[PDB]
Amino acid sequence: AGPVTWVMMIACVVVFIAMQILGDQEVMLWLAWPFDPTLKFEFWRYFTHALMHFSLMHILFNLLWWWYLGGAVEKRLGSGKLIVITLISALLSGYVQQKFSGPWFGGLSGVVYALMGYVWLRGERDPQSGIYLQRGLIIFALIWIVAGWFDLFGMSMANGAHIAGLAVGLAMAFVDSLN
Amino acid sequence: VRMX
């Protein structure tokens, strides 16, 4: 786990702790996508919704995938590629999510989906580069994708965040594998 | 509150 993979896991844990201590809504109020016009210029918020988790399962599953795919992308393609994947997926997923359902949402899984789509498609279209999605983990990803679409979990799923996430990672692996 |  390089510096990006790491600061991210850290920031997510630090934020999850604040949500336990201060409560979910308090932290949302500070970190959610702008939910009032008076907040539109608070720029951290287009990204910081990625940092908030609402259950132990949410955090744990997201950081497992982040650690593994995030970490792969970091070590083999560099810190910079992971930064850009993250900023773009966070911002785009946040955008589509809020459009469909309003600003009240959170989670790294828009980003994790971009890493899934990215690492898979780059492995298919580009063997040499050194990044692949192992067949077993394609299955575990597909099931993970499927669960959200049909809502087979306690709390409701950000479905725009997911389709938007994956689309970004596919677009970027496409553009990258092209060379 | 939707998770992701």
Residues 6+ apart with CB under 8 A from A162: A93, A109, A110, A113, A145, A148, A149, B4
When CB atoms are compared, the residue of A28, A93, A155 closest to B3 is A155
Name the method of structure determination: X-ray
Nearest to A32 by CA among A104, A112, A108, A111: A104
Pick the residue of A66, A105, A153 with the most B CBs within 10 A to test the interface with B by mutation. Answer: A105
Sorted by where each begins, the domain ranges of chain A are: 1-179
Amino acid of residue A102: G
Say what the resolution is, in angstroms: 2.3
At A175 the three-state DSSP class reads: helix
> CA-to-CA distance for A115 and A126, rounded, in angstroms?
15
Chain-chain contact of B1 with A161 (C-beta, under 8 angstroms): no
Listing DSSP states for A128-153 in one string gives: GGS----HHHHHHHHHHHHHHHHT-S
User: For the purposes of burial, counting CB atoms within 10 Å of the CB of A125, is it exposed (0-12), middle (13-18) or buried (19 or more)?
Assistant: middle
* DSSP bridge pairs for B2: A105
Nearest to A51 by CA among A20, A9, A93: A9
Query: How far lies A42's CA from each of A34, A35, A38, A136, B1, in Å?
Result: 7, 11, 9, 41, 21
